Amino acid sequence: TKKKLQDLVREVDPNEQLDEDVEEMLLQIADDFIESVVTAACQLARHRKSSTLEVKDVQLHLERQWNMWIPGFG
Amino acid sequence: ILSNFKLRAFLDNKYVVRLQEDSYNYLIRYLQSDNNTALCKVLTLHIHL
Amino acid sequence: LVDFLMQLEDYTPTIPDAVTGYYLNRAGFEASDPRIIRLISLAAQKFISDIANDALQHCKMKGTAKYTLTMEDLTPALSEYGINVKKPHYF
Amino acid sequence: QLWEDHWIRCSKELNQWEALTEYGQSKGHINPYLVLECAWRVSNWTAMKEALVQVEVSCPKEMAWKVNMYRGYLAICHPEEQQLSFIERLVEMASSLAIREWRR
Amino acid sequence: KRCFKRYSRSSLNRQQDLSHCPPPPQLRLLDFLQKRKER
Amino acid sequence: LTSVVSRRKAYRLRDGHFKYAFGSNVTPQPYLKNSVVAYNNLDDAEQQAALLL
Amino acid sequence: PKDAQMMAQILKDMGITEYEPRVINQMLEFAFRYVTTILDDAKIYSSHAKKATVDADDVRLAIQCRADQSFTSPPPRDFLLDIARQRNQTPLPLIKPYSGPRLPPDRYCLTAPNYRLKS
Amino acid sequence: CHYSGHHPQPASFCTFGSRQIGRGYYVFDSRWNRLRCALNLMVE
């Protein structure tokens, strides 16, 4: 469809190849990253007042352990 | 086939081949190529090496 | 004008070769030729001198509103590199 | 790119200069030199006046004499008015530079 | 064990995924060919 | 992917920690005096590419 | 010096009867650094909690985050079993006696000279 | 810093991703969602 795995490789290094067995591992890395973020976000969601919302503002406070900052609104 | 009384036993039996490891290694090289899954079905079912 | 070979001779190391050489022996190196073990000492000097110069800047802006090094000049200088040191002053 | 280069070469010699003229203003692959090679045999004269700034500034591997020759196409055949007072400077510079590359 | 995974019903990512895919920037004449035929 | 490629290919640093090249061998050999004067220094565009490549 | 005696007792409870006088002070510094960091983590959670006082649930979340990333432990009793299960189907190569302990093939060994440097 | 017979439980461990299904079987947070629905709303 669009941006499966190869165009992201071109986004960094124009001439780089990945083995067939490496692609699935990276997706599982992303799959584990997705679950870890949402579980922690839901934990903070239940911490605001026992539950409020999935909030983009508290996600910024969550990314301090990942040492990353989204260029979003905030 | 069931009424021939000879081909029915043919299906319910396997053809054993006593080959060297190099010959099997030659065979194991060819079977990995494209369009060989159907041939591999006979090997895993009908022929014991 | 002059290549790096004799410029390597011009440097005057402070850490003896018996300290850097022992580090290579711990990691599994011979440490038996003079030439490779001078950059690690220079790299070690650069790493400490940058902290030393940073501590000097903090010390010279302490209370101006002889030179003694305390924890007030060490815990902020080590903060940028990621070193977090916190020692209790009593008990 | 060998396929593209030979396709351009084959089409140029088959009298298909109109197709290459329209190819020079596609969404991408902007090639001003290709336009300058193909647009002087048709009525499309507006493309030449635009595709000269990036032609001169790019300095593509000592390719100044051919651009100077291409400057005469707009000077000799100009729609509104052209003074035709610097044609001698054009040919003298082109001839001197052509001889200069002859010695190379 | 690896090539059987790309032959045992993996056409959903091969003949359906790869359809209507934009051409690579190395081949820039196919779009011109399509435009000439359409026009 | 940046971490993996960086362990297999060369790069150059601009004003600190920024990795931008991820490409060819434009980095000179530091044991050559011609590279030292070239390092101290830092139609016409093609020759500069030759000085790096 | 009440912390010195209990720390020695803790080491004694683990079957250690000989130590150095400097490790005891190191663990006291470790304990001080551990609580000071987790109190700061409580402060940022309390400040993000738009509350004046410090609640006790923020400490529970703060210590939860500390154990999530700052401590390492292998996955016990369930993940390693799956590894053996997914590798149980791997067969064993045949034994061909020629000279005994053969070696992995050429290239996949630590015997290779640098390409750039030559003679 | 206390001494007692009972083991001090922090109750704030690393919480490795694992859910309890069947009280004996454990899942790594995924890949057992649709199947569990299929064999629980049908068998029982």
Looking at this protein, list some descriptive labels:
part of a larger assembly; 8 chains; C: 91 residues; mainly alpha; F: 53 residues; two-stranded antiparallel sheet; 3 helices; globular; Transcriptional adapter 1 (chain F); Transcription initiation factor TFIID subunit 12 (chain A); Transcription initiation factor TFIID subunit 9 (chain G)
Whole-number tally of structural domains of chain G: 1
Biggest interface, CB < 8 A:
G-H, 13 and 11 residues
How much helicity do the residues of chain G have? Answer: 40-55%
Helix percent of chain A reads 40-55%
**Element order, helices and strands of chain G?**
HHHH
Main beta sheet strand tally, sense and closure of chain G:
none
| Content of β-strand of chain A | under 5%
Work out the helix count of chain A: 3
Globally, the shape of chain A reads elongated
Structural class of chain A: mainly alpha
Shape of chain G: elongated
By oligomeric state, this entry counts as part of a larger assembly
Strand content of chain G: under 5%
Biggest sheet of chain A, in brief? none
CA-to-CA gap between the ends of chain A? 31 Å
Number of domains of chain A: 1
Order of helices and strands of chain A: HHH
How many DSSP H or I helices of chain G? Answer: 4
Q: Compute the gyration radius of chain A: what is it?
A: 16 Å
Q: Could you give a short description of this structure?
A:
The structure is cut from a larger assembly and holds eight protein chains of eight kinds. With 91 residues, chain C is mostly helical.
Walk me through the structure:
The structure is cut from a larger assembly and holds 8 protein chains of 8 kinds. Chain D is an all-alpha fold. Chain D is built from 7 helices and no strands. In chain D, 6% of the residues are buried. Chain E is mainly alpha-helical and 39 residues long. The longest helix of chain E is centred in the last third of the chain and has 9 residues, at 30-38. Chain F is mostly helical and 53 residues long. Helix content of chain F is 43%, strand content 8%. In chain F, strand 1 and strand 2 (18-19) form a beta hairpin. Chain F is globular. Chain G has 119 residues and is mostly helical. Chain G has one domain (1-119). Chain G has helices spanning 2-13, 21-48, 57-69, 79-86. In chain G, helix 1 crosses helix 2 (21-48) and helix 2 packs across helix 3 (57-69). The termini of chain G are far apart. The chains are: A mainly alpha (74), B mainly alpha (49), C mainly alpha (91), D mainly alpha (104), E mainly alpha (39), F mainly alpha (53), G mainly alpha (119), H alpha+beta (44). The G-H interface holds G 3, 6, 9, 60, 63-64, 67-68, 71, 73, 75, 78-79 and H 1, 3, 10, 12-16, 18, 26, 28.
